[PDB]
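Hi,

I'm pasting everything inline rather than attaching a file, because the server keeps stripping attachments. The sequence lines come first, and each chain or strand is labelled.
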Amino acid sequence: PKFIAVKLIPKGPFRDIPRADTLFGAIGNAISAIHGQSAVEELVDAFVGGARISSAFPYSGDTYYLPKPLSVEPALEGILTGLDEEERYTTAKRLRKAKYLDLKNFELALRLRPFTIPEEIPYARVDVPRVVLDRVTQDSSIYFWEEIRFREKSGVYFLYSGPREVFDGYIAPAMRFLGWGAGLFEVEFHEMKIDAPGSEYSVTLSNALPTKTPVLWRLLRKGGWSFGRRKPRMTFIAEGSIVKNDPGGMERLELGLSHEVYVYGLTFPLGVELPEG
Amino acid sequence: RFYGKIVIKGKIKAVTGLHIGSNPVIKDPHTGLPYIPGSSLKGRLRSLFEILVNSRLGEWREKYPSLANYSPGSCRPDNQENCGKFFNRKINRGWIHVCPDYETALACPVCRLFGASGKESNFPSRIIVRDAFLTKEWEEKWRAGEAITEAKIEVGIDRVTSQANPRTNERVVAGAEFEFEIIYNVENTTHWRDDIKNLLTAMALLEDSYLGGSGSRGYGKVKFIFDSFEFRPLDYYRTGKDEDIVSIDAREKSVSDILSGFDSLFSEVEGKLE
Amino acid sequence: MDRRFYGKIVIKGKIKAVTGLHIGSQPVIKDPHTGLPYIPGSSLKGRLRSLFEILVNSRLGEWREKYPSLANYSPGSCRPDNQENCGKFFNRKINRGWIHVCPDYETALACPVCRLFGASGKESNFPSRIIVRDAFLTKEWEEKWRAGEAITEAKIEVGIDRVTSQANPRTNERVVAGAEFEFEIIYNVENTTHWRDDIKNLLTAMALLEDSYLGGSGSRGYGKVKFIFDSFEFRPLDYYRTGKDEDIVSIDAREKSVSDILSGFDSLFSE
Amino acid sequence: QWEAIQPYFDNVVREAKNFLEWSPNKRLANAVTVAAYLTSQGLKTNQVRKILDMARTTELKVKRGEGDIKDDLVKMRYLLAYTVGKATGQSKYSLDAFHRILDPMLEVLMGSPKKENFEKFYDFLQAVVAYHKF
RNA sequence: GUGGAAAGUGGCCCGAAACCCUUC
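And the predicted assembly:
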């Protein structure tokens, strides 16, 4: 699968890594700003109904990090038999701090091969103690509101498995529209390749709202105000688990506004052969 | 609608350094460099502007019609929100200006240029103050050492013992351009001229008052040398090969840029206007 | 309770100090890159404020109704009674010393020092209304330092007491006598009746600082600052909002003996 | 007190007069011993303090003041021999140890060298100074 | 159709007190 990538060069801090559905909210407000009111995601319904967004990590250089094939957590001891008998604790590096992996340690982090964890993670989840001021006098009020902070050459990217006509018609104009300060944003398109074996059961690469089909999956809970009235909790699968008993978990219509907000969660496959389960 | 995103890009020279604190130390994110957080720039840029319209509320009063039910004051004597003095918003100790409804804050000249919230209001700030991040002269200056910060010691001198006490400050080195930027949404095209004139007014309140921490004794005295007024109307995003305004750059003094060349800069953007 | 400014009268400084100047740090005080002498604002503001409040300490007996919140104090000192408020015109334990700080707003709004150099403390903290720029060495002495003819020459003292003089010396490195320090000073103007009795209240302090010293060991020289003014001009809100290259400019002929241009303060002035 | 390895370390610096394209530990590993000999003799600071001010001023002239130190380097070179001539008895017997390093260094290093070339000497100039007290 | 929308790490503070570059 020759799915292209979109690398977002930041210029400073982000609030959070955009969680693979908040982009589809932000894409929605972008195509609500441009193109009038009816070329918005109602018109892009059948176009994201065959093409996916599915966010992922920063890169820290050019090494495009990828989250985890979560089908190595059951039989991790079946993977690492080649190590010496002090391999447990490397499993704890590959279970508990199992966050993100290089591509070369992702084409073989699945397919039952001994991957290696990276450590050059471009995170500074720092605790910026912001504003304290009254217009006339003192104010004490240390309210924290922490944010994320990047490395010198790093940046988020995400993927796009779709036809390039639909990409350059909605999302690729929108990815330069996005560029309080934390919206620092420079867009640079790219292509990418993933080896991705046979498609029995494999990764979603997004946050996921499945169609009732649970296989080995971290649960998530995503809020989001999204023009005022607080969106519900909308239980999600986290970044990168394995629901491939024919997915296609549709986007969920909500209530609260004049026009409906409808939340992403539809996923796109990859290739994994998982051991058992 | 949206016909927007004006980019004011520039460089801010701290003639006597900055002390945007966090020994008090400057904000230092990931490389050891300092930086002006865009929060502090927007915040001081609204305190100066809000006190300007606090003085000038009773006389504008027809332009910006929602700023008429105020009759200046702070609501700290009568400890309640929504009191018609000028500004309520009791956060934890402070009292700032936020209009408590969207329909009012389409017209309050401070509030419609930095937004409104509270209960059932939700006005977006119409501006994006990017944090300024140490332009590439002083980055390469920093690589060979050059001591980008400066530990500065003050004292509390007494008068009956004449004793003293160390109160170190560690401010940024006097003279450092910071790669300053401003992004502004240009919704409601009839508001826009007075709006960016008001933002330039608030920026012109700087260079004559303190940014950054323990001012009024030094530590402020910044200078905007902003180069490129740009525009991104509706075709920079659907396309972007060409067709955007680039204004004059070199020696644009902000106390002279405000109107003495601004209408010679406004009328090119009147050429697009849509 | 209102700040409510319209104003910012500015004076463009030019403190050509004669007979030395020794401001200290960790030796003169240039921490930034262009190694130099400079006067760092706060050493001018604090030497203004302490001298002005020493004047107000002796002259409170006759103002005493004008600036009415001054009348809550005594001309004594809070040195014996070590409580942070005592009822005398000295309070506010910083770490071991004492400075004048009105711990309220409305008592600081009338106090003739604290309305011009700012309060602090519990819930009050008045903004200082004066802005004291860091006085950097002028372009003339910068050009006359690039060409040799060095500035900041050293000077050695000794501690030759009334014993067998084996006096341990100590270098000082003062600034050379004659150094235009390109000073600037801004005063925020609020609510005009609160105004004319402020800069006239301010300059007297500077006049006392013209008689006294600033910067270090001033009991043995090291002062004589000679504030030869340059601008005395005023920058109203009528052009911070609309900058038409206009301003209300006074005259900077030599100096004022005691407020000779008190009449020219109000030349084109309504605010 | 003084032993001949220390003037032979000075002689390594003076006969191996080239330190400019050498390792940054070749400076410090000798600069202790140099200063050790320079603190084996008296060498109190206040007559050396005239030299260091000429270094720091030319160091600021390096930090975006000019292209190089062309004419002002002579008075750096002159004032060493001037202090040698002024030094009498308990000093000229001793201060020549500080003198025998900076002249053969700055001889070819008045080749109008780069600011990155002179900085390797100014770091040695600073490097001698603290081990007077250590 | 963005875990959102409004939110200056701020207010106050002299690097000050004293010291013959001089004796044997």
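The interface with chain A takes residues 1-3, 105, 123-127 of chain C (CB under 8 Å).

If the labels don't parse on your end, tell me and I'll reformat.
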